[PDB]
Amino acid sequence: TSQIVLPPHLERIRERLAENIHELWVMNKIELGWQYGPVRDDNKRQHPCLVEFCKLPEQERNYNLQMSLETLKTLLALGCHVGIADEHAEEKVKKMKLPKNYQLTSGYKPAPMDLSFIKLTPSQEAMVDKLAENAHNVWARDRIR
């Protein structure tokens, strides 16, 4: 799976979406007990990806935004409507939808909402295998070469 590159019309969304999506996603790598440290290794109980979006360096700055860009480019490549009509409900339109659920421990625990009071679309339930296969697709077009 490799469809198109994303246009820049969303770029007003993307940076605030980044300062959201890190503050949703980065909590997920402390349930082992990893913390922030200087150098890359796991034998001594750390994972330095636990740093805020702009705080990271540039190659790690985009390494948070790539999961978003996965969930954006194939969506816009899907042909369906994914134009930003319902503008995302944090930092632009004050409805307070994005951060709802969190629990703080000995570690960086920002606020992902595990949203479950709405149905999920017929698409994104079907795109679970698409987006999880795209991992091996990205890895396979590297590996077979």
Curated annotation (Swiss-Prot):
Maturation and modification: Channel activity is modulated by phosphorylation. Phosphorylation is increased in failing heart, leading to calcium leaks and increased cytoplasmic Ca(2+) levels.
Q: Where's it found, cell-wise?
A: Sarcoplasmic reticulum membrane
Observed phenotype of the null mutant: Embryonically lethal. Embryos die at about 10 dpc, due to defects in heart tube development. Cardiac myotubes display enlarged rough endoplasmic reticulum and cytoplasmic vesicles that contain high levels of Ca(2+).
Tissue and organ distribution: Highly expressed in heart, lung, cerebellum and brain. Detected at lower levels in adrenal gland, stomach, thymus, esophagus and ovary.
sequence repeat locations: 1-98
Q: What's the stated role of this polypeptide?
A: Cytosolic calcium-activated calcium channel that mediates the release of Ca(2+) from the sarcoplasmic reticulum into the cytosol and thereby plays a key role in triggering cardiac muscle contraction. Aberrant channel activation can lead to cardiac arrhythmia. In cardiac myocytes, calcium release is triggered by increased Ca(2+) cytosolic levels due to activation of the L-type calcium channel CACNA1C. The calcium channel activity is modulated by formation of heterotetramers with RYR3. Required for cellular calcium ion homeostasis. Required for embryonic heart development.
Protein family per UniProt: Belongs to the ryanodine receptor (TC 1.A.3.1) family. RYR2 subfamily.
User: What does its UniProt record remark on the domains?
Assistant: The calcium release channel activity resides in the C-terminal region while the remaining part of the protein resides in the cytoplasm.
Per UniProt, subunit arrangement is: Homotetramer. Can also form heterotetramers with RYR1 and RYR3. Interacts with CALM and S100A1; these interactions regulate channel activity. Identified in a complex composed of RYR2, FKBP1B, PKA catalytic subunit, PRKAR2A, AKAP6, and the protein phosphatases PP2A and PP1. Interacts directly with FKBP1B, PKA, PP1 and PP2A. Interacts with FKBP1A and FKBP1B; these interactions may stabilize the channel in its closed state and prevent Ca(2+) leaks. Interacts with SELENON. Identified in a complex, composed of FSD2, CMYA5 and RYR2.
**Protein's name in the database:** Ryanodine receptor 2
Q: Which organism is it from?
A: Mus musculus
